[PDB]
Each structure stands twice: as structure tokens, then as C-alpha cells.
Design a protein around this nucleic acid. Structure first.
Lengths: 209, 23, 528, 507
DNA sequence: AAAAACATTCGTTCACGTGAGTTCCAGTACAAGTCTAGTC
DNA sequence: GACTTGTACTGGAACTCACGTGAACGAATGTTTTT
């Protein structure tokens, strides 16, 4: 039954039959063979079939012994509805853990995830009511976030990267804050990221200190 | 004639069931 | 389980054999009454012990006969299950005796039999029935001992007489029986003594226990003290969510059918296993292909189209409702509810829960409030979770003795039928005439079944059909007994007393001839 | 009313029927389709023996017995069915509208005379007997023929002859921008032109509300259960008929079908000897009863003769005051007795006289009732029933006799002895207040059988391939929330007044 | 000696299957009147 | 020489009730188990 009508729902209530999407017959006709069922085609499982596919297949369309393709991976992912049980910091930590485990730092993006970035977009440091929006700084911060940089609006002790535009009046304040903090964050300029993006690699900070 | 049901001519259109309606 | 022991004391002396021309002999009436009793007891398959003792017999068969006392009394049958042998004895090989006897000795013998035979098995109730004409000498020295023994044993006692406490006399004809002035002085003394003993045993109500053979033949009184009580259905009458009153409902009125059912048996050999019935399902095809039961499926018609509907599917989609529900949907004026709309096949009498003062007083308050406000309760009734819910009306019913609710089912919108009938009052063609109306009024007056008694200023019923036993059971029992006793014999005709009890008193019949003739002549009726 | 009912749905296919005057508003064509589907569904349950037809006019494609132009007979007169409902619903949605436009056509000229002729031919085609022949026109155009007067005159005359024949025409005018006016052109086409419907209508016809109101109840034509003879005496006999004004409603019986193909199957029952296996005739078998160690043998004829006292009919007995008839002595649903006059002439006059005199004296006729041959007699009371009609002269209580069965002695059961406990006046007053609070007006048709309604809903859902069944509102439930709100605390004070502090009315 | 759990019972309801009497309506035989083809 | 109409007959289908049976089911009885 390709349509989950009242009859299909009634059959679903009873656990003595198996429902298969009509695409199964079409696939059999195209291949002219008795291909076995897959979780994608079937919308219901009998206890016996449920046990049978539990060993061969997983809770989702993914299986163990038979590999998966791009189409199979997409179909499996479409099965999962949603997952919002975590927090952004947890996601960042998990992403860093996976990148470290699989040495995936060579990707064209996401290298800046390990580094927190602060921007001197406020006339008064550590103030949320003096935004200087409407300059290259905002677009630079947005691009850094897109590339994977963790943009932080608060000057916490955990900050590792700070970007200062053409205005160098508060360089003394930033240096004093760096000295006060146990962990020191290197002073960086906006041109550094502009040069790095084209190269897609973390350029040495010595020439952009 | 009045109140005749347009579906079954010859049978007066029965009023819809109301149940209990306290005054 | 429930059990009852009954001993039937029958008078046999020659004095009973006497009769007047045109009047059935008292012995025959007593024989008919006892035959009906034994027929109901045996054909109803009820575990009731029946014993028969006859006083006035020429011989003497009595354990207490020793000592030249209580003579001419025979204990024909002790306490045992009723059997066709007892019916054969009553009907055929029992004859009147030429010796008189005192019914007090029969009472003593019956009490001794009850005491001796009751010890064997548990007996919920013990009953004694005495059929006599009270036309024999008796000794009054045993009154105190008799009363004390009866009270100690606590056994019900019933008396049946040839007359009750001027056209032809018919058995159970709802008319006078044994016209006055036919009672002798000895019979007067017997009536006095029976009345006194009945009053002492029971009281004023006991005065109603002295029946007559003709009356007992069409009143079902013989089984009054032996009939059981139907089980009670317990539930909780709830008005809203919080208030609840425990209640028990009995089936006050219910159509009575025949418990025993006929079964087909081959004429050649009368064995159940000889005849076997088989059902086969075949398709509407020339080959008449056969199918198995599991192959069959359930479906329903949908206006020339058949839609499959599996039994499991029906159960899944079936209307589910919590069982054993007795809730008050609302209260409405008694005028709105009309007797025409009553449905169902039963009437429920609802009392409070057994031995519950709080529930009893709450139900009494509800009944009194409904009666004072002249209201009834529209309620929802469900016997159990597997029974379809019903909408019914419960109305108060208060009597000097007991008060209870009476529940009767009410119709749904689907049940009602909308039929239009042409008016008769305005029909000029069928309009009546003043003479015709006067004739019909005379006919109605001449055939009134109720009498306006001025002594008590009340209405007395002359034809109380509610108290007449169903003739079908009596006819069935009579025919079954006749066939059992006479295998090769045509079935007997309907008993005369049944027809007499199924007909109105001769007074109204003879008082409505001239009005009926006037109606016939005035109203022209011709077949068409 | 003898025969069946025939209905034809004339649906206009003009562009005016395919347009949305406002958003979230079904088009007139969609409304007409919905009304047709509702009528079909209602007829499936109420009376499946009726005939329904669907005809579309104004479409490019044509399909008629006359081979006319721009008229399509989608469904000829036939009994309603699920297939027809599905076909009608195929055009329900916007995709359905597109499919109908592509396969059927649009924007085509037509003539009212041609469609009336097609409807007349369709009516003539049916071979049964039609008690009512009706046509319904679903159009939203005031002047279909305004440019040509000849076509309008032809349509008018054709409608006149159709009305003269006996066909009842109704106009289900739908909402249109300018406004629909019957008085302009359709005044002389409708068989009956109510004076009220003479102005201009800016909204849909009020009859659509009635049409869309689904009815789930088997409606049955009047049919006398039995025509018997009431015998006042041996010679004085009148002919009467018995009807069941109230009858229990039962779900349609199930039908056995072959699972593989879902077709009706034939059920056959046979009897054979366990030893020989040959068929046994009814004479071969015998009826026997076992009573302990005794067996009694009787034949079918003897068994029928057992329950046989008098011939079928109503043997009249004396009259009884209505007071003696206890209201709680109910045994069987009552019946209605009405004079027949088709068997014996003059019975109507005697029946009317008897009814009038019984009403005047307030008495009831006691009778012995024997419905069928070889059946035990019962005792019945015929109480008079005068004609009663509510406002606007609509009959609600037909005139005649009401037959109520009086129970026999064996039909009554004795109740156990119970000690009577009286209630103090304060408790009675509190209950009177509570009852007055819960006062409500009861009508004979205020409730619906939940089981039958749910069964019908499930059957309709299965037949029409619906996503899920339509849950039925239970009018029989006590809706306890409203009762709690109304009673306030009355329950609490009553309980504290009557119920002991430690009673626990739950076990 | 006293309290709690399980096997058994039994009236009651629901529902199926069969039979049998009634009413209504569809199909068909049968008498019978009418109209046509044809001629003169 | 055929049609067509009106009468009457027959039989099918639905209605209703009575009879007989099988299965669920809720509550009471008697027996058994435990402390």
C-alpha cells in the first residue's frame, strides 16, 4: 500500500503483516529479480521481520555488513527527525574532539574553530551598548564565523585571537589585559585574515603581530 | 409541506440531536 | 444451593366426595390443583422436595399411627424429588376414601415428616399446603402445641378450601364460587379455626392465605412461598463527578420463556447422535467450489457495493465505553416522558445497596424530591462493558411498605418512526352519528371491568389479567404429561378451566348482549 | 407514496462556476460537488434503493442518449454507491478541477431546453416506479439566455411541460458577484416560486445548508405490520392495522465474502445421519425432550399445535378505567392500531366512535391479542390517542389506539424484603434544590445511538478510503464538567448532611 | 485460629443461524381492444 | 398480424418475531494457602 489510508492504519495496528512501499515492485520489475526488502521501502515491521532486520540492519536505514552510498546516506539522514538536546558549547567541544581524533584539520574550513576571535567593534571595551556596526569590522567578523572561527562578544580569559582595525588607540589597553590574564592572546590585525582566506591556511602571526 | 427534508421527500427533516442542554 | 421442601396434605374422606349437580367435586378440584403443582415442580427441573400425605384414607400408614392415634392417615410419599410416579398416583390410582379424619392429625404427621426428613439436607424454606373441606369433627386440645411447634419450626402454612372467604359455576371464571348458604355449622367452625390459626401464625396478612381451589387454579398462589428471588445487579448512581449512591437493581418485569428446548431426533432411532448438521460455504459458480471457514471474511453492504470488514478490524474500530455505568444525564418533567416511547424488554426496580443506611436514606431523599417536584431522571444505563449503552428514564415509586426507582429504556432518534396518519375526527365521510355515539356509550358502560365500590369509595377490578398465569406453560405441561403417560394417544384438548380463566366474568358477557345487537344493527359492516 | 425516488444533479460548467470571489472560499463548483457528495452519502444510509444521477452541461465534451451538444451525463439514474462517490470526489480538489476541465471541457454554449430534454429522457429510461421525480440545478447565472429570446422561450416552455409531466425542479442558486435574482428569468422555470425568494440573493441558497447536513438513520416507508380483525362480538368484526411507531434500530447484518476475490458466497446447511450419511427429510426427524430418566417424543405438527388457543386477531374484552393501568407494568414496546377500511367497509366509523367515547369516558379496551397463527394469546390494552399537532399544523401524535401488553403473573418477579428508611425534610429539600439546578427539557429525539453512529462512520470511512474515521460525539455522556460547575458546592453540603463522616462510597 | 488468593459456578447479554407469517413491488402470462398492410 | 393496455398471477426481497445455540463476563460460592 503506497497510501497510508484507513485500511493501512488498521493493518498497522495489527502486528501480523508487513507493509511495503509500491516502489518495491517497480524495483523488482526493473531488475527482474526477487530483491529482498529494505527499511526504506517498508513502513511497518512484523516481530519476526523486525528481529530479522535488527541483526542485519540498524535502528535506521544504515546496515552493518553492506556498505552505504551517497544516496543511502542521504536516505538514512532523512530518517532522523531532529536533535536539539545539546548546547552550542557542547557542539563546539564535540566538533573539536572529532577533528582531533580523525585529524580533519586539513579541510578548507573549520580550522578557526579551535581559536576564539574577538573584535574591537566597541568604542568602550566590554560594553554592549556602544556597537560600531557599519564598517569592515562587522563583515570581517561574519566571514571569520563562516570560515569556522568562534566569534566571542565578551573579553574572557579564554580568548586566543583579537583583531584590531586601523584604530590602534587601545593597543595599550589590550596589551595590559593580555598581561593581566594568565593566558596571553596574540595581537593580530585585520589584514592577516584577509591574506589567510585566499591561502586557506593559518598564516604565521609573527609577520602580522 | 413545510419542514420537508430535501433528501427524503415525504419524511419531515428531523432536528439535529442536541442531547442535554441545561436551562 | 437454594432448596425447598413441600408436603401436601390431601383430604380423602367421603364427605369431600359429595357434590351438587352442575358443580365440580371438591376432590376433583384438589386433584387438579395438586396436578398443576407437581407438573410445575417436575417440568421446571427445580430441586424442590415434594411429599404427599393423605388423611381420611381407609388404611393407615403413618409413623405416629402407633397407639391407636392419628388413624386413617397415610404418608403416601416421603420427602423426595418429584417424579412421574407421583403424577400417575395422583391422576389415576388415587381414589376417595369412605372414612373421615381430623386435619389436626394430618398437621401433626406433616410436621413430624418435615422434622424427620429435613435433617438429611439443608432446606432454605419449608412449606405445608392443606386441601380440605373442613367438614369433619376435630379436637381443640392441640391448638397450643400446634402453634408452638409451627413457630419453632418456622414453616409456612397454606390452606385451600372449596369456597372463598348467580349464573353457572365455572372453574376460575373470575366469578362467585360455592354460593352462600351452602356452609354447614361444622364448616363454619372449621373456617373459624383455620382463620384463627392463620391469624396467629402470620397476622392480618395471613388472612389472605386461605385460598380456594378455583382461585388457586388461576392465581399462581401455590408457588408464592416457593418462588426464589432474582440476583441483584449492583452499581453506583452518580449525578455528577462527586456525588454517588450505591444501588442494586432487580428485574421487576421480564418476559418468561420456556427453559426446556426441543431437539431433533431421528424417528427410527431416538438418539441425539443419529442426526448431525453440517454447514458448507460455496461460491456462486457452476463448479460450486467449496471454501473453508478460515477463508471466509466479514463485510457489509454499502448500497450495491460490498466493502470488506474484518472481525478484528471491527473490534479495533468498535465503539468502546466503560462498563457498568448508571449515571444521571439530567432531570425532566414527567409530562415530557410518555409511556408510548418506552423501549426494551425489561423494567428495573432500583433499591439502595444491601444493608446500607446511608445509601438507603440518600435514595429515599432522591425519590421523595423527584415525587414532590413531579420529575424523572434521564439516565445512562450499561449492564457491562460488552453491553451497548442505553438512555432510559428512572421515576419514583413509593408504597406504604417500600420505595424504589423504576427504570425503563427510552428510544434513540433512529428507533423512532415518522408515520403520518389521516385525521379521523375531521373526516366527514367517517363522521359518526348521535345515535351511534349513544349506542357506543351504552356498550362501553355495559362492559366495564371495574366497579366503583361505594363502601370503600374505590375501584375494584373484576378481570385482573395481571394475576392470571400464562396459559402456554400450563398447556405445555398438560400435554407433556399426557404424552408421557399415554405414548400412543392424541393430545388432549385445552382444559376448560384455562378457557374460563382466559375469559371475562359471565356478568359482563350477559349484560352486553342488547348493546352489542344495537351496535350491530346501527353500524353497517360488510366485507370488501 | 409508493415507489422510489429519482434525483438528477444539474451542475453548470460555465466560467462563473470556476472562480474564487475571495480567499479561503471554495468555488461554486466545489460547493456543488460537496453538496452532491453529502447527498450521495446520506442516501447510501437512509435509503439505498433510491436513484441518483449526475449531469453536467456547458462542457465541450458531450455524452447523452440524444447526442446533444455541450451536455454530458456523468452518471445515469442508478442506485448510489461508493464508486460514484469516488468519481464525484475525483473533481473535488484543485487538481480535480484541472482534471475535470481537461477531460470534460469549459467555456461552451448550452441551452436550458436541451438539458431539460436530457433530464426527461433520463427519467423515462428508468424502468422502476418513481414516487418522486426531482431535478436540482446548480447554477449561478441569472440570465443564461439574455442575448437570444428564442432560446429563453424554448427553455420556459420546456420547463412548463416538464412541470406538467410531474417533475419537480429546484434551483440551488450559488453565490455570484452581482447578485442572484429569481424574479428576473428563473421565476417561471421553478415549479413552485415562493414569494419570499423574489428579492436579490447576495449569498448561497439556504437549501445548501440542509443538503450538507448529513443524516445517519435508516428511514423506512410506512408499512403495516399486520392487518387483523377486532371482534367486539362473534358477528361484529372490524378490520384494523398494526404499526410499530417505535422500533429498535439494528446494524445491517454481516455478509460472508471470499477473501481472495471479495465476492458474495453462498451458505448451505445440510443434515445427514452419523451412520448412513444420507439426507434426512423433516418428517424423518422428531422432537423429543428429556426429563431425568423419562423421554417424551413429539412431532413438529404436535409442537405447533401445543401453542394454539385461538385464531389470529384481537378478541375484545370489557373496558377498564385508565387508572388501573399501572405505568410501571411495562413488558413489550407498544404498537399503534389504526382502522384499515380496505378489508371491511364501515369499520372507520365504528373505530372513530369507539375512540371518541373512550376519550370522553377515559377508558381503555382490554383485548386478547394473537398476532400470528399458532401463537399463545396475550393480554393487551388499547388506550385512545387523539390527534395532536404542534405549531404550523404539523402532526406529531397520530389518532388511533395505543396497544400496550399487560404482563402475566409469570412475567412479574418478586423483590426481596427491604426495610424502608425515610429521609428528613432537610435532605429532601436539598435534593429538590439539586434537581431544580439540573432541570432540562427532554425530547423524544434528543439522543443518538453511539454504536450505530460509530458503525456507520467506520463503514463510510472504509468505503470511501478516508484517511481516518470521523469520531462521533457521544451525546449520551453526562458531560460531568457542566454539572459540577452548575451544582457548585451543593454536593459537598448534601454529603456532609447525609453521608457519615467515614463512609467511603467506593468499596 | 484468622486473612487472602484461585477454581468453579451461573444468570445475563450479545450475536449468529434457521424458520415462518406479511407486506410490497418486479417479472410474466392472458384476455382483449386497436391500429396497420393490403386488397378491392 | 402485430402491438399495446389493463388484470391477474406468481415469486423475490425486506421486515419482524420466535426459537436454539455459543462465547464473554461480572459477581458469589467453596476450596486452598499462608502466617
Amino acid at each position: 500500500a503506497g497510501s497510508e489510508n484507513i485500511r493501512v492504519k488498521n493493518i498497522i495496528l495489527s502486528n501480523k503483516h508487513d507493509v511495503v512501499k509500491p516502489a518495491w515492485l517497480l524495483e523488482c520489475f526493473k531488475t527482474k529479480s526477487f530483491v529482498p526488502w529494505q527499511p526504506r521501502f517498508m513502513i511497518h515491521m512484523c516481530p519476526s521481520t523486525k528481529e530479522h532486520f535488527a541483526r542485519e540492519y540498524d535502528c535506521y536505514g544504515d546496515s552493518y555488513f553492506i556498505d552505504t552510498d551517497l544516496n543511502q546516506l542521504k536516505e538514512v539522514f532523512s530518517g532522523i527527525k531532529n536533535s536539539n538536546e545539546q548546547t552550542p558549547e557542547e557542539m563546539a567541544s564535540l566538533i573539536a574532539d572529532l577533528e582531533y581524533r580523525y585529524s580533519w584539520d586539513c579541510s578548507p574550513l573549520s580550522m578557526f574553530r579551535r581559536h576564539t576571535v574577538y573584535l574591537d567593534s566597541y568604542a568602550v571595551i566590554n560594553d554592549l551598548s556602544t556597537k560600531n556596526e557599519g564598517t569592515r569590522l562587522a563583515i570581517k567578523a561574519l566571514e571569520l564565523r563562516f570560515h569556522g572561527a568562534k566569534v566571542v562578544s565578551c573579553l574572557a580569559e579564554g580568548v586566543s585571537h583579537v583583531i584590531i582595525g586601523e584604530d590602534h588607540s587601545r593597543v595599550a589597553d589590550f596589551k595590559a589585559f593580555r598581561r593581566t590574564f594568565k593566558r596571553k592572546f596574540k595581537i593580530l590585525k585585520e589584514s592577516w585574515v584577509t591574506d589567510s582566506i585566499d591561502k586557506c591556511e593559518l598564516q604565521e602571526e609573527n609577520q602580522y603581530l | 409541506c413545510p419542514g420537508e427534508s430535501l433528501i427524503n421527500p415525504g419524511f419531515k427533516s428531523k432536528k439535529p440531536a442536541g442531547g442535554v442542554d441545561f436551562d | 444451593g437454594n432448596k425447598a421442601a413441600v408436603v401436601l396434605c390431601m383430604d380423602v374422606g367421603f364427605t369431600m366426595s359429595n357434590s351438587i349437580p352442575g358443580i365440580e367435586s371438591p376432590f376433583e378440584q384438589a386433584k387438579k390443583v395438586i396436578t398443576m403443582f407437581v407438573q410445575r415442580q417436575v417440568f421446571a427441573e427445580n430441586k424442590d422436595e415434594i411429599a404427599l400425605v393423605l388423611f381420611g384414607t381407609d388404611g393407615t400408614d403413618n409413623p405416629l399411627s402407633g397407639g391407636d392415634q392419628y388413624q386413617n392417615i397415610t404418608v403416601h410419599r416421603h420427602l423426595m424429588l418429584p417424579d412421574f410416579d407421583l403424577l400417575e398416583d395422583i391422576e389415576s390410582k388415587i381414589q376417595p376414601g369412605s372414612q373421615q379424619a381430623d386435619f389436626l392429625d394430618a398437621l401433626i404427621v406433616s410436621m413430624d415428616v418435615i422434622q424427620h426428613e429435613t435433617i438429611g439436607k439443608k432446606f432454605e424454606k419449608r412449606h405445608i399446603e392443606i386441601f380440605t373441606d373442613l367438614s369433619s369433627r376435630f379436637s381443640k386440645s392441640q391448638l397450643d402445641i400446634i402453634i408452638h411447634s409451627l413457630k419453632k419450626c418456622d414453616i409456612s402454612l397454606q390452606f385451600f378450601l372449596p369456597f372463598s372467604l348467580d349464573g353457572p359455576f365455572r372453574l376460575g371464571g373470575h366469578g362467585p364460587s360455592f354460593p352462600l348458604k351452602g356452609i354447614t355449622e361444622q364448616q363454619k367452625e372449621g373456617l373459624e379455626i383455620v382463620k384463627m390459626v392463620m391469624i396467629s401464625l402470620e397476622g392480618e396478612d395471613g388472612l389472605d392465605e386461605i385460598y380456594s381451589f378455583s382461585e388457586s387454579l388461576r392465581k399462581l398462589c401455590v408457588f408464592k412461598k416457593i418462588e426464589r428471588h432474582s440476583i441483584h445487579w449492583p452499581c453506583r448512581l452518580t449525578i455528577g463527578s462527586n456525588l454517588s449512591i450505591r444501588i442494586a437493581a432487580y428485574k421487576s418485569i421480564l418476559q418468561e420463556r420456556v427453559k426446556k428446548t426441543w431437539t431433533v431426533v431421528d424417528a427410527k432411532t431416538l438418539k441425539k447422535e443419529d442426526i448431525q448438521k453440517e454447514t458448507v460455504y460455496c461460491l456462486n459458480d457452476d463448479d460450486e467450489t467449496e471454501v473453508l471457514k478460515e477463508d471466509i471474511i466479514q463485510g457489509f453492504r454499502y448500497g450495491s457495493d460490498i466493502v470488506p470488514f474484518s472481525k478484528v478490524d471491527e473490534e479495533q474500530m468498535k465503539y468502546k465505553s466503560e462498563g457498568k455505568c448508571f449515571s444521571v444525564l439530567g432531570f425532566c418533567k414527567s409530562s415530557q416522558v410518555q409511556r408510548r416511547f418506552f423501549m426494551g424488554n425489561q423494567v428495573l426496580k432500583v433499591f439502595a445497596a444491601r444493608d446500607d443506611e446511608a445509601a438507603a436514606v440518600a435514595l429515599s431523599s432522591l425519590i421523595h424530591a423527584l415525587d414532590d417536584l413531579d420529575m424523572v431522571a434521564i439516565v445512562r444505563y450499561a449492564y457491562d462493558k460488552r453491553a451497548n449503552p442505553q438512555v432510559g428514564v428512572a421515576f419514583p415509586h413509593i408504597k406504604h411498605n417500600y420505595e424504589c426507582l423504576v427504570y425503563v429504556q427510552l428510544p434513540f432518534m433512529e428507533d423512532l418512526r415518522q408515520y403520518m396518519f389521516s385525521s379521523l375526527k375531521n373526516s366527514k365521510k367517517y363522521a359518526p352519528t348521535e345515535a351511534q355515539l349513544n349506542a357506543v356509550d351504552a356498550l362501553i358502560d355495559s362492559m366495564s371491568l371495574a366497579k366503583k365500590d361505594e363502601k370503600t369509595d374505590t375501584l375494584e377490578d373484576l378481570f385482573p389479567t395481571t394475576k392470571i398465569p400464562n396459559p402456554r406453560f400450563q398447556r405445555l405441561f398438560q400435554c407433556l404429561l399426557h404424552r408421557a403417560l399415554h405414548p400412543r394417544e392424541p393430545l388432549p384438548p385445552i382444559q376448560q378451566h384455562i378457557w374460563n380463566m382466559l375469559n371475562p366474568p359471565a356478568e359482563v358477557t350477559t349484560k352486553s348482549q342488547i348493546p352489542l345487537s344495537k351496535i350491530k344493527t346501527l353500524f353497517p359492516l360488510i366485507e370488501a | 407514496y409508493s415507489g422510489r425516488d429519482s434525483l438528477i444533479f444539474l451542475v453548470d460548467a460555465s466560467k462563473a462556476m470556476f472562480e474564487s470571489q475571495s480567499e479561503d472560499e471554495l468555488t461554486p463548483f466545489d460547493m456543488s460537488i460537496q453538496c452532491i457528495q453529502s447527498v450521495y452519502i446520506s442516501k447510501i444510509i437512509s435509503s439505498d434503493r433510491d436513484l441518483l444521477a449526475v449531469v453536467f452541461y456547458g462542457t465541450e465534451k458531450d455524452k447523452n442518449s440524444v447526442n446533444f451538444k455541450n451536455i454530458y451525463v456523468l452518471q445515469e439514474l442508478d442506485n448510489p454507491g461508493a464508486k460514484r462517490i469516488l468519481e464525484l470526489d475525483q473533481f473535488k480538489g484543485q487538481q480535480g478541477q484541472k482534471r475535470f476541465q481537461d477531460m470534460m471541457g469549459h467555456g461552451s454554449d448550452y441551452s436550458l431546453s436541451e438539458v431539460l430534454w436530457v433530464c426527461a429522457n433520463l427519467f423515462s429510461d428508468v424502468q422502476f416506479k418513481m414516487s418522486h421525480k426531482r431535478i436540482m440545478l446548480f447554477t449561478n447565472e441569472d440570465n443564461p439566455h439574455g442575448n437570444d429570446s428564442a432560446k429563453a422561450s424554448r427553455a420556459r416552455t420546456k420547463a412548463g411541460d416538464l412541470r406538467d409531466t410531474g417533475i419537480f425542479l429546484d434551483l440551488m442558486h450559488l453565490k455570484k458577484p452581482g447578485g442572484f435574482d429569481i424574479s428576473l428569468f428563473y421565476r417561471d422555470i421553478i415549479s413552485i416560486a415562493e414569494d419570499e425568494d423574489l428579492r436579490v440573493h447576495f449569498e448561497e441558497s439556504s437549501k445548501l445548508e440542509d443538503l450538507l447536513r448529513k443524516v445517519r438513520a435508516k428511514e423506512t416507508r410506512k408499512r403495516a405490520l399486520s392487518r387483523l380483525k377486532l371482534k367486539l362480538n362473534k358477528d361484529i368484526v372490524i378490520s384494523v392495522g398494526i404499526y410499530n411507531l417505535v422500533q429498535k434500530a439494528l446494524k445491517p447484518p454481516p455478509i460472508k465474502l471470499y477473501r481472495e476475490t471479495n465476492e458474495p458466497v453462498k451458505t448451505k446447511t445440510r443434515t445427514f445421519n452419523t451412520s448412513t450419511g444420507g439426507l434426512l427429510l423433516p418428517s424423518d426427524t422428531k422432537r423429543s425432550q428429556i426429563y431425568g430418566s423419562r423421554q417424551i417424543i413429539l412431532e413438529k405438527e404436535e409442537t405447533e399445535e401445543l401453542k394454539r388457543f385461538d385464531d389470529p386477531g384481537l378478541m375484545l374484552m370489557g373496558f377498564k378505567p385508565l387508572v388501573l393501568l399501572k405505568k410501571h407494568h411495562y413488558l413489550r414496546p407498544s404498537l399503534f392500531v389504526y382502522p384499515e377500511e380496505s378489508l371491511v367497509i364501515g369499520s372507520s366509523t365504528l373505530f372513530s366512535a369507539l375512540l371518541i367515547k373512550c376519550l370522553e369516558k377515559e377508558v381503555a379496551a382490554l383485548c386478547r391479542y394473537t398476532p400470528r397463527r399458532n401463537i399463545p394469546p396475550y393480554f393487551v390494552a388499547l388506550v385512545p390517542q387523539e390527534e395532536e399537532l404542534d405549531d404550523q399544523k404539523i402532526q406529531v401524535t397520530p389518532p388511533g389506539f395505543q396497544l400496550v401488553f399487560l404482563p402475566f403473573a409469570d412475567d412479574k418477579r418478586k423483590m426481596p424484603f427491604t426495610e424502608k428508611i425515610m429521609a428528613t425534610p432537610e435532605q429532601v429539600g436539598k435534593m429538590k434544590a439539586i434537581v431544580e439546578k439540573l432541570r432540562f427539557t427532554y425530547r423524544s429525539d434528543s439522543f443518538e445511538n453511539p454504536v450505530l453512529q460509530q458503525h456507520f462512520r467506520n463503514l463510510e470511512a472504509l468505503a470511501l478510503d478516508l484517511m481516518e474515521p470521523e469520531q462521533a460525539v457521544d451525546l449520551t455522556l453526562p458531560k460531568v464538567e457542566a454539572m459540577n460547575k452548575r451544582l457548585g458546592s451543593l454536593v459537598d453540603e448534601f454529603k456532609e448532611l447525609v453521608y457519615p463522616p467515614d463512609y467511603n462510597p467506593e468499596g
